[PDB]
Design a binder for this molecule. Structure first.
Ligand SMILES: CCCCCCCC/C=C\CCCCCCCC(=O)OC[C@H](O)CO
Ligand SMILES: CCCCCCCC/C=C\CCCCCCCC(=O)OC[C@H](O)CO
Ligand SMILES: O=C1c2ccccc2C(=O)C1c1ccccc1
Length: 381
């Protein structure tokens, strides 16, 4: 692969898109540099026709995977580089969920010493009021809407915790108290909250002492927790997502311990408790999803009958009301010229993107930094 020998060092990249979406025609141009040795791209794109009719984040993937870092156990699998300098044809079908579709065809090749990506894109079936043409996606804000589902979960969790607080304080003060969540003799609410295990989870007093600041009614940790999850769900930084996930894992372990008490130790059926548990599971799942948005995995499999590759993956774009927009990608790559090519075993490219804005750019632009490194190929016994 003399091709891969083309990508030591820092190559100049040019990119040119001509696109038509639901009839609105537009042209994008981008210039930058590529470092296949660190898998790092830096690029600035400007729309040359005026107002871009779609959101910038939906054109990132259409807008040079030959700049990926292929590690040493994987050199025999880098198709993109091994097609150079003749280049390759990359074809994508990008389906947006409950919305339209992009069809793209690009040629990627060396022109002089410049890696050139030339794209024709055609989008159909878009709703002019949907997420795409309505410009309802997020670009890169620090703060954002928590979304309706996160809000339902956290407010319900908080209200239930404040109720359990009130209920604890009342059986403390009258042993004969019953609350709405006490029902006959099957479903119990008060004997649970006022047991050993309803303060500091029944653990603090043995580990830190009864005086501890941490020997609180469980519902105090509850209130703290649901408040936190709301707040962080309003943040869009990577560390916000890390905290969310780790606090959720704590909540999950606490739920399993408390349920092991509820059954098996106290023998009560507490509906408020089980609801708390379901909420914490939902939050944990959303925690997983939030955290997995920092890196996208492009799944590359070989396509021998066409002498190239095919690719599969999903993008989730943050929508301004707190939701997420799915973008299914199907991809084909076929060499332009001849000569041997490298047909890889199944593997993937791990991709991470950072969008930003030149404060000095009057035109409709996108500054894009990108890190891509390959993984997947199993190792040598
Ligand atoms: C502060 C972070 C606190 C994280 C501790 C998790 C608390 C929790 O598990 O939720 C409380 C619930 O009300 C109990 O049933
Ligand atoms: C909060 C997470 C609670 C889960 C902690 C595990 C329960 C536990 O450690 O119980 C051990 C023993 O009862 C005490 O020394
Ligand atoms: O899950 C819970 C549990 C299980 C066994 C023994 C005690 C308890 C609680 O304190 C209770 C709880 C506390 C606050 C909000 C919701 C639920």
């Amino acid at each position: 692969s003399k091709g891969e020998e083309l990508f030591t060092g820092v190559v100049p990249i040019l990119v040119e898109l001509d696109g038509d979406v639901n009839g609105h025609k537009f042209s994008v141009r981008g210039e930058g540099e590529g470092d296949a040795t660190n898998g790092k791209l830096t690029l600035k794109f400007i729309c040359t026709t005026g107002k871009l009719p779609v959101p910038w984040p939906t054109l990132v993937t259409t807008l040079v995977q030959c700049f990926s870092r292929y590690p040493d156990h994987m050199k025999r699998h880098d198709f993109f580089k091994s097609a150079m300098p003749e280049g390759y044809v990359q074809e994508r079908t990008i389906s947006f969920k409950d919305d339209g579709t992009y069809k793209t065809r690009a040629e990627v090749k060396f022109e002089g010493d410049t890696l050139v990506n030339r794209i024709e894109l055609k989008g159909i079936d878009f709703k002019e009021d949907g997420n795409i043409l309505g410009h309802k996606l997020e670009y890169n804000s620090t703060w954002g809407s928590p979304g309706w589902v996160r809000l339902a979960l956290c407010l319900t969790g908080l209200v239930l915790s404040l109720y359990a607080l009130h209920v604890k304080a009342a059986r403390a003060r009258d042993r004969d108290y019953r609350a709405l969540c006490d029902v006959g003799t099957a479903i119990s609410c008060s004997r649970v909250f006022s047991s050993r295990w309803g303060r500091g989870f029944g653990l603090v007093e043995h580990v830190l002492g009864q005086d501890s600041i941490l020997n609180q009614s469980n519902s105090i940790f509850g209130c703290i927790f649901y408040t936190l999850q709301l707040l962080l769900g309003c943040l869009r930084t990577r560390w916000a997502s890390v905290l969310m996930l780790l606090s959720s894992l704590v909540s999950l372990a606490g739920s399993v311990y408390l349920a092991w008490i509820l059954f098996f130790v106290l023998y009560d059926f507490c509906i408020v408790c089980i609801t708390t548990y379901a909420i914490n599971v939902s939050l944990m799942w959303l925690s997983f999803r939030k955290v997995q948005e920092n890196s996208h995995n492009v799944y590359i499999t070989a396509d021998k009958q066409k002498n190239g590759i095919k690719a599969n993956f999903k993008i989730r774009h943050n929508v301004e009301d707190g939701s997420v927009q799915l973008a299914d990608h199907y991809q084909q790559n076929t060499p332009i010229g001849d000569g041997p090519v490298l047909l890889p075993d199944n593997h993937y490219l791990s991709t991470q993107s950072v969008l930003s804005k030149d404060p000095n750019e009057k035109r409709d632009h996108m500054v894009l930094l990108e890190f891509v490194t390959a993984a997947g190929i199993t190792h040598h016994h």
